[PDB]
């Protein structure tokens, strides 16, 4: 059982290699889908279609991981160091380094591209009708509001007063270019969506309701709605999707490389027993 086991060592290595390639192609397709989700112009309906295809490809990965076997051995199901005895005299073992490779172990559980995202002000006006409110500004002690859409500048008061070119005194109407001329500092925005005042940081980056970070949930059929961090938690779309797939990709690639080195090892062990020469032509 010297060249017999080495031959089995080869078959195991080929079975795993083929399965890894199926998985690698699925991951690379998932990657390209994700690149399309990010860089394409994509309706709400498009992102759902993309995710439906991603889910199916992730599911194809788990199936490959669960079904691929050679002689009882599920080559992608468990970290397993298979010792194959390659030499008659009992010292020659070559170890196949098998690794658990599935959706969970690749870090792709819940990987998605259509889930709720942190809300931006841009995203508020881009997905909701009747988005109203104002940015705030401050030139020292004096406090200003600037209405989004109209660009009118008013005093940041209880009952607010018109500002003119900076003076409240009746002189053309004040606008944002006069505010930055006064070295004014953009503060927090106040934005009402569907009749609820939300607060936004200077940069439109983060949006809060009583201190809770807000997410925009998107349905396939175009309608969007706002929800908190806690309710978004389990379903939010994946941060750094490309990095997640690339991580999975290099994990799959490292097993693939190793297999290549182990097959070369087996090939040599077989040629060493047979005393086999490759021929100049056969080498070409």
């Amino acid at each position: 059982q010297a060249s017999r086991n080495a031959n089995d060592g080869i078959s195991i290595a080929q079975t795993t290699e083929g399965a890894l390639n199926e998985i690698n192609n699925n991951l690379q397709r998932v990657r390209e889908l994700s690149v399309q989700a990010t860089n394409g112009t994509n309706s709400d309906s498009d992102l759902k279609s993309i995710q439906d295809e991603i889910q199916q490809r992730l599911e194809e990965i788990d199936r490959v991981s669960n079904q691929t076997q050679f002689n009882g051995v599920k080559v992608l199901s468990q970290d397993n160091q298979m010792k194959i005895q390659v030499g008659a005299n009992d010292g020659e073992t070559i170890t196949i380094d098998l690794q658990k490779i599935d959706v969970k172990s690749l870090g792709l559980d819940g990987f998605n591209v259509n889930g709720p995202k942190e809300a931006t002000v841009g995203d508020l006006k881009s997905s909701f009708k009747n988005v109203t409110g104002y940015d705030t500004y401050a030139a020292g002690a004096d406090k200003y509001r600037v209405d989004i859409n109209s660009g009118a500048v008013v005093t940041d008061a209880v009952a607010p007063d018109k500002v003119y070119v900076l003076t409240t005194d009746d002189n053309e109407s004040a606008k944002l270019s006069d505010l930055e001329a006064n070295n004014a500092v953009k503060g927090e925005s106040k934005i009402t969506v569907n009749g609820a005042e939300y607060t936004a940081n200077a940069t439109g980056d983060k949006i809060t309701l009583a201190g809770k970070t807000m997410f925009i949930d998107k349905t396939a059929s175009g309608v969007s709605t706002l929800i908190n961090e806690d309710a978004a938690a389990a379903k939010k779309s994946t941060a750094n999707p490309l990095a997640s797939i690339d991580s999975a990709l290099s994990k799959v690639d490292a097993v693939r490389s190793s297999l290549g080195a182990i097959q070369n090892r087996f090939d040599s062990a077989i040629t060493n027993l047979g005393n086999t020469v490759t021929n100049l032509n056969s080498a070409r």
Binding site: Q28, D46, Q56, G260, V277, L280
Partner: protein
């Protein structure tokens, strides 16, 4: 320690830390799977008649010093594969003017191996195998212009973000019999890339017998731009198998199937053979192959093809061979194979064909070989094969033939009259005996 038989020294896995004394007449040496840490000028002093040398997979870190193979002027093939972290000094291949084949698979080499002078001495080099390294950018040094016999390059498994005109400047003028750029990904070369203009034509003034671009995704929009970029390149045989991004796939419309523009850049390439198997193509759209006017062989095997639009094969005037095996075709009718007048070989095995139209093979007078095995046909229409007078081989087995009389009459008589044509043996579902053996009253 080595086994010397004839002209061959097998010195595999013998615990060698240096090159052993060998009889000086050997012309073939295999020193793989030893612990040789370093090769230098004294290593191969003895071995003049040596033609074939393998020193694969030593313990990690093999160093090859200047002038290691100097004096080995008969050496034709040198294999140094799977030497992890291979360290080549720059004159490592001095003396190898006669070498035809060098392989350095999975040796952790980066692109410096092509842009440095490591290969300068290899004036007779034909074949260079650089698979599975860390070459990120293909940048052959200028001495490559003077390598008149260089015609094979294999770069499979290197992560190559892009290939561009300026990268490959020093392969301009070369004719490659085989350029294997398989599974390199070309990840940057997509439809959102700002790099296309500057990229130009990577194959400018280069021609290729076999261009293997298998395993690279080739989303439809990438294929279009890549082939737009390389427009004009003479390619005899184009391999795009496992273009896992190319088809829309069955069930989804996120990605596009290739269309009449996808392969326009190959207008003037003279392509004779094209492999597009395992690429998730779902529909063959009209004129998708129309620019392949010289095409002789086309494989679309193991795609997801369920739909062939009218004029899908328009422009394939020279097509001799069409492979549609392992797809999802449910039926065939006359419109599917219009414009394939020269066709000689049609493989439709391993589909899900449940019906053949009355005149399915009308526009195929020259058919010599027809494969319908492994489908789901219960019957064929009377007369279906009658115009196929050039037919030599037909495969009909592993289909649920319905041997009812008279439904079966034409096929059983036809098979009995043409029995030397049938490859394998079509069986009756139910009885399991040969269709050819049924005689209808």
């Amino acid at each position: 320690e080595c086994s010397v038989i004839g002209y061959n020294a097998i010195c595999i896995n013998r615990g060698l830390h240096q090159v052993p004394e060998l009889p000086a007449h050997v012309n073939y040496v295999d020193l793989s799977l030893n612990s040789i840490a370093e090769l230098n000028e004294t290593s191969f002093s003895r071995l003049q008649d040596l033609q074939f040398l393998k020193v694969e997979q030593q313990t990690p870190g093999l160093v090859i010093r200047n002038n290691t193979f100097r004096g080995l002027s008969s050496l034709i093939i040198l294999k140094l594969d799977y030497n992890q972290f291979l360290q080549l000094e720059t004159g490592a291949f001095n003396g190898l003017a006669n070498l035809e084949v060098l392989t350095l698979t999975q040796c952790n080499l980066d692109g410096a191996v092509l842009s440095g002078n490591f290969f300068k001495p290899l004036t007779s080099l034909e074949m260079l195998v650089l698979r599975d390294n860390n070459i990120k950018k293909i940048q052959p040094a200028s001495f490559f212009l003077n390598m008149r016999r260089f015609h094979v390059l294999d770069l499979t498994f290197n992560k190559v973000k892009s290939i561009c005109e300026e990268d490959l400047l020093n392969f301009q003028g070369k004719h490659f019999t085989l350029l294997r750029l398989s599974s390199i990904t070309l990840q940057d070369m997509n439809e959102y890339w700002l790099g296309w203009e500057k990229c130009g034509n990577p194959f400018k003034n280069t021609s290729i017998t076999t261009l293997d671009l298998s395993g690279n995704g080739f989303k439809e929009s990438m294929a279009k731009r890549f082939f737009d970029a390389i427009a004009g390149t003479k390619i005899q045989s184009l391999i795009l198998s496992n273009s896992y991004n190319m088809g829309s796939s069955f069930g989804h419309t996120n990605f596009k199937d290739p269309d009449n523009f996808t392969f326009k850049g190959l207008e003037a390439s003279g392509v004779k053979t094209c492999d597009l198997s395992k690429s998730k193509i779902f529909a063959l759209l009209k004129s998708v192959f129309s620019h392949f006017t010289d095409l002789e062989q086309l494989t679309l095997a193991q795609n997801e093809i369920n739909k062939i639009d009218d004029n899908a094969f328009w422009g394939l005037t020279h097509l001799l061979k069409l492979n549609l095996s392992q797809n999802f075709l449910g039926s065939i009718d006359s419109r599917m194979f219009e414009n394939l007048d020269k066709l000689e070989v049609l493989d439709l095995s391993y589909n899900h064909i449940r019906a053949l139209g009355d005149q399915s093979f009308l526009g195929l007078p020259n058919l010599k070989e027809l494969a319908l095995d492994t489908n789901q046909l219960k019957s064929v229409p009377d007369g279906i094969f009658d115009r196929l007078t050039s037919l030599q081989k037909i495969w009909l087995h592993t289909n649920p033939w319905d041997c009812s009389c008279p439904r079966i009459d034409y096929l059983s008589r036809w098979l009995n009259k043409n029995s030397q044509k049938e490859q394998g043996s079509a069986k009756c579902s139910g009885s399991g005996k040969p269709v050819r053996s049924i005689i209808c009253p």
